[PDB]
Amino acid sequence: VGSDPVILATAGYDHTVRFWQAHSGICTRTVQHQDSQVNALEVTPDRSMIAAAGYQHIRMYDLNSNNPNPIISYDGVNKNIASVGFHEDGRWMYTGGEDCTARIWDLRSRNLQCQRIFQVNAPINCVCLHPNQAELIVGDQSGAIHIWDLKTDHNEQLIPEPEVSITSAHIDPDASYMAAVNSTGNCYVWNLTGGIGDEVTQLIPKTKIPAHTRYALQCRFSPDSTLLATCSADQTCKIWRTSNFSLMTELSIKSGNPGESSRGWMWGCAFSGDSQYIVTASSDNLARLWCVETGEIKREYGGHQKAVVCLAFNDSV
Amino acid sequence: YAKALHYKELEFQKGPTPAILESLISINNKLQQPEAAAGVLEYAMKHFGELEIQATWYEKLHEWEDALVAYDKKMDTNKDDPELMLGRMRCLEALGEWGQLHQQCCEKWTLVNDETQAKMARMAAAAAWGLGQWDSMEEYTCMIPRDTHDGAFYRAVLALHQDLFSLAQQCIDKARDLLDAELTAMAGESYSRAYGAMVSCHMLSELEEVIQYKLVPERREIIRQIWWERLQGCQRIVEDWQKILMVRSLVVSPHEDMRTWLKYASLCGKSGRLALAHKTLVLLLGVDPSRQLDHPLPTVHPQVTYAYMKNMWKSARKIDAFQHMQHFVQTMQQQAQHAIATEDQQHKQELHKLMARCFLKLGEWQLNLQGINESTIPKVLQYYSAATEHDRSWYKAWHAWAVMNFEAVLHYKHQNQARDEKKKVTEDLSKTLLMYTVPAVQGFFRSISLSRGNNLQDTLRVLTLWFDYGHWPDVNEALVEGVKAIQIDTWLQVIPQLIARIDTPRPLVGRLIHQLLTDIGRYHPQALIYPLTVASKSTTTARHNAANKILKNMCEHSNTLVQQAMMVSEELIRVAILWHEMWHEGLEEASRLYFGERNVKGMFEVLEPLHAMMERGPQTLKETSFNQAYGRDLMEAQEWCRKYMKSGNVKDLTQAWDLYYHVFRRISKQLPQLTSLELQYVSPKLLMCRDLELAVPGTYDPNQPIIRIQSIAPSLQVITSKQRPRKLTLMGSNGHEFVFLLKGHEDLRQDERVMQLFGLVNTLLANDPTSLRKNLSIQRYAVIPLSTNSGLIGWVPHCDTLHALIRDYREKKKILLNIEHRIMLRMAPDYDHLTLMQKVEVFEHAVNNTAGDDLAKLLWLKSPSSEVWFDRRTNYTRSLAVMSMVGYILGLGDRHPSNLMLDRLSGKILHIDFGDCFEVAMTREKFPEKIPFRLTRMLTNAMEVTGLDGNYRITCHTVMEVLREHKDSVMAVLEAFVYDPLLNWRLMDTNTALNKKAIQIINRVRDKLTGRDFSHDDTLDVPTQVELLIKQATSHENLCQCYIGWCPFW
């Protein structure tokens, strides 16, 4: 399960976190995550252990050893832990909670509590890590984007759209852009300053895209720096090109009929190593493998009786 | 159309088509509902841009302005259309602009066919009338048939202009005769169609009056008079009134009648046309359209001038207004003192009251322009004082004066606090504050003397001062003196806030308080017997001391009444709580305390007075029986407690709590064994009571003979709940039954004060003509506190909670009562634990998959027929909105379906459970509310189709307006009990000084009143703030997070 070249994870309300092989459609293994739905799913940079952010706990299951129960559980947090992220050295963990706190946990320490605490007023919707590993971008429901310096402890907040809740924020490998997405359905993209070495990293406004009519759940960059994807409540995930910020591809699960049910939402997406394909997690209890360029449906894995809120995709050598 | 409307609108729910939308506002029209049509329009616009008329739409909407702008937009793009021309013309003839109409008719005379020509001629006559071309009028007169009423009518117009009398009279009589059979056809249309031709007969009899006026010089004054009265008499919009008056103008020029055109112009301006009223002011003043603006305004007609002045204020430039106002006052005091000969004392007095309105507006405008600082204080003091001089009887003046003194006091206190945030200071502060304090008291009191039935704001001001600064000698002087001058009735109104302060440490206050409450004790004691009996029993000793002092003071006359009061009250507090429940809660509490919190002290503390209650002995049957069964185990557990007191051994304690657990799980099996109680067992003393002279609780008001308790019904029905209330009922001397909810462990003070507030707001809406017009009201119930735990609530007849009737439709049509909830948990088991987005998706799933038609469908079935159905639905809508607004102002949170109930008959709605106030609701820790009040889709759908923008939103506007208007008084009543000594407790429960937080509250309230609630920078008008509010109570994000037992989806 951890010895396979492609680790593809899927989680949801059915109380299971399931591992797949991406080139087949056949379910590799199923792990029980009871009593909580999974808010976030992320695989560590060293591919040793996979982490799930649920309600009032963070449960870490072993990828290398097949079919265990969780190695590392982190409790003591009240209400949700919505978002998670990892350091490239595998030592530190970062979690956005609904406690209005972005936290830094020590994984190699036995301590049940957290090593560092950054609290804001509003519940924090997202946490993502700048490639230089010196800073943490933290979005919340107030509409504030907090840039948290992990060294100076200095924090700098930025409010492009006031009073509307930002949901997800991510940053590309080359650190040339920063994109954030909100409940409004707009997607904002800023240019980054290369003052990274002296701890400056200024943000310069570039584009604002009326991406979706309805809410926009997540926005995630392709490792190419070429493609910026945004998933939404409109049953659509749109892939944009970083050049013109024009629409390249539009993924649509829409009923093909005006009167059906709102068949459910596209919650998350993760780009493949070569940026040829894109993975999707939907409320229809399906994880789908799409062709980025063509738009065709390459694969479909249903694993679940209930909904799918999460995705984890890892290609590393 | 009541019935036709139902099928029409459900047919609309099938689908929303313009063909339905045109068949909508029509049936709206001859069912006469004006606002609902505005709704049809609103939705039709927010969705369908097909139009295909917006013009007929605005026209039947009685909005001509947008109709014209639309009609030009429609005509310029298209060709020349005979119909569109006619419509575009109707807009203008209602507009009251002839100058355009005459041109527009004569500009194309070719395009008028014999159909369009006959219709043309009529309006055209009205056009030529205004300009004073009677020839145009005459030529276009002969086109209009002598058979239709307006023809022989305008014939009379011409005959009277040409001074042809006999002709005119015959024509008037015939003109009646033709329109006669028309009015016969109203028959549903009552204050309605009758208005419609009340216009016609209006004009006719007016013409009789003309042929009188020109015929002889006597009646002039008398005509001006009937005109006056029925100007005041039947009130109309401007647009019909232009015709209404211009008819009258057929003889008399504006300068004889001037008052008429004056308050007419007042109607124009207060209706939102400044330009029209401006033109009227030029016509009446004799002069002065704005050309030379540098010249002060003609004093030729002081009334007209002044009118024109506040008219200018309501426009953009207030400064020129200010200046010309000062020059005018200064001109007028000189026209007054010197030019007066002793012969006219009539000119003097009116010119002087004029001067008063002048000084007042002066002050108010100084306020508006500047704001409060050291400089304006004495200026407005002076203007106001002068106004006080020139008219001694004006309540407006004295009120503004006193309010201003009060506000100065507040300005200097707040400035002092602003100095404290960052020895001579406190002394200068003392002198200054006293200096502005005493005239405040004086002015407030005298202003009250002239009120006679609304004193309320002013009275709560009197008490705010009295309680804050009262122990100062001068202020005490003013207080006792004002007390001497005033009538004693005034303080009935204020009785509850009085008795809250009886324990006041400052002696000089406690004195005048006891004195006043004693004087009020003399006359109508029925008011003070209940609350002072409640306070006669209190833990803090001072209260019940000074209380029994005044009970004493009452006895010397009222002793029988007093003793029956105390007696019945005691018996009530007893029946409210039987000992077994007392021990139920007492032991649950004690055990929770000692075992959970490891607290022995608290356990003993809550345990012991219960044992005292066990000591004084049963005087009654049920208590005797309880004593019989459990008394031994109880006293034994007590002896084990004393054994832990002496020994220090914990096993003696476990041994006591063994007996305790025994009697407890012996009782808990009997808890829902009582669905009823009999008065012979529980309270023989009450069973005895016959023909008391004691008035029924809360039933007392000064203007009617006393209704008193004849008897008390033997059986009391105990309602099953967590609090387990009792149904009490009483029989009076008037013969009618009076029902009272008996509630244990609940504090009725909050809701009491809130009910006082709603009485006030009821008066407020009683003052607004638009609200009076629409029957806007809040259902209110008499609240009678007994102890802090116990109390009496007036039951509301024919009323069922929302949850109840919902449940009814659930089991009747056999859909699962919780079915939504069960599907929520079905797809999402963790649901309360989900992220906002998940929560929402879930909620939408639940809603798309469920019909919210329950409330409205049942209500359809609830009604005996379609008409009453409609009526009810409307009354609903209205009341709903009333408490919607008054509720968001008061900040009522946590209304679950049960938390309100519907009247079935009147249909109107009641809110209860006011224990949740202000922003406390959203500030609570677990499950905070994002909602002002519930707009949830069942309530939503309960109204007429998409009833959002119909009567609902329009009324939201209305109420909001009223509130922003009367706002000062509302702040008075709110700040009255926000800071009240005993009730400040509820502000500290956000944990699971108080000054600061209370001031936060009142600040946010004033924010609500000024429109500072949403964004601090902007000031929101009623409509937009209503828009964002309704947008807030809408958004699924706010509705999904909610407590699941609060039922967001219903």
Ligand SMILES: CO[C@H]1C[C@@H]2CC[C@@H](C)[C@](O)(O2)C(=O)C(=O)N2CCCC[C@H]2C(=O)O[C@H]([C@H](C)C[C@@H]2CC[C@@H](O)[C@H](OC)C2)CC(=O)[C@H](C)/C=C(/C)[C@@H](O)[C@@H](OC)C(=O)[C@H](C)C[C@H](C)/C=C/C=C/C=C/1C
């Ligand atoms: C106490 O227990 C007895 C006293 C005896 C003396 C002799 C022994 C045989 C014990 O010492 O109980 C005892 O063995 C004991 O503590 N037990 C009982 C068996 C389970 C293990 C343990 C226990 O959990 O008790 C518990 C232990 C003490 C620690 C608790 C941890 C926190 C909290 O739950 C408790 O604070 C209250 C304290 C307490 C209990 O479970 C008791 C049995 C029952 C409850 C229903 C309570 O939870 C309580 O919670 C609010 C209530 O519901 C409120 C009071 C009102 C109702 C009518 C309680 C009625 C209980 C009457 C019981 C009494 C007089």
